[PDB]
Design a protein around this nucleic acid. Structure first.
Lengths: 155, 155
DNA sequence: TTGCGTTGCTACCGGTCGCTGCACT
DNA sequence: AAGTGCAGCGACCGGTAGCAACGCA
């Protein structure tokens, strides 16, 4: 029971998946879901007067799992947060990057390495990486900055 | 079961009854060492990765070897003090002898053992890692976070 | 006995490498 | 199916907060 899911594959905005595979608009939505689990946990925290998370803790993951959403797991969500960042911040540029990678016949893996360079430049436009994630956008607030992003960002 | 609480001691000065001295403390790392030695060897024979340092595996090893008394959090707590004993036993010992006068708790002994360390961080251009890497022992012990930042703050 | 403070160490955090499982010749 | 290439996510890592338990008041 509770089986594995089929791989992601690069899509244009709006585009739907090719059967036994998933699109990137799905991927983004997943994060939004995670959000709605953190919402649920936070409520379960006030009641029972426990400490209120503010971010995605392993708890939340555990929680999604038990309500049957294992598809929201820790390593995946980290694997692709750099991209969720891109989508949230400059959906414009995410969208274009998706097209480019689409018509160049890229796999999802390349996309990941690709999505880095814009973010870097966006940081150059600003300064503090954390700032961006740091409650800059209500959606990106709940997620931790990845380590790699931080070090490389300013180099 | 739960080890007798640590209590500050001069060099030598074997403690008595329901307590353990600081010489015993340091002897714990010495032991940990022989466990890493044992692990390293096994890995070779089992053709797996041989660690340069004391990893969760080693701890687990010892527990099996009935030496739970060597555990992760503890060693970490006191890792900074051991550094001193290794590097400048001279200075460590004086810290200890003084501490017999005031008869403070181990908590004090620790949070104080730092001052002399950071002093050594100077001269060596705050290359703590190098410093640990210098001694034959210590090598096997990951520099603690506090030390880096608490040193870094001064910088 | 009665209660507290200190501290040993369970138990879990946030991170993530690299093994499977899966999709195809 | 065996073989290869991808990628999901199990299965740990290194850290450390904070509860019990013990030893002392």
């Amino acid at each position: 029971d509770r089986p594995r899911e089929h791989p992601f594959v690069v899509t244009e905005p709006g585009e739907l998946a090719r059967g036994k595979k998933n699109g990137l608009d799905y991927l983004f939505n997943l994060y939004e879901q995670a959000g709605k689990f953190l919402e649920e946990v936070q409520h379960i925290a006030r009641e029972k007067g426990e400490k209120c998370p503010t971010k995605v803790t392993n708890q939340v993951f555990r929680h999604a799992k038990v309500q049957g959403a294992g598809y929201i797991n820790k390593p995946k969500m980290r694997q692709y947060v750099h991209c969720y960042a891109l989508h949230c911040l400059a959906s414009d540029k995410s969208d274009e990057l998706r097209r480019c990678c689409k018509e160049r016949g890229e796999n999802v893996g390349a996309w990941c390495q690709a999505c880095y360079l814009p973010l870097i430049k966006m940081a150059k436009e600003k300064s503090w990486d954390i700032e961006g994630l740091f409650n800059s956008h209500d959606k990106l607030k709940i997620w931790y900055v990845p380590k790699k992003l931080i070090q490389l960002c300013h180099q």
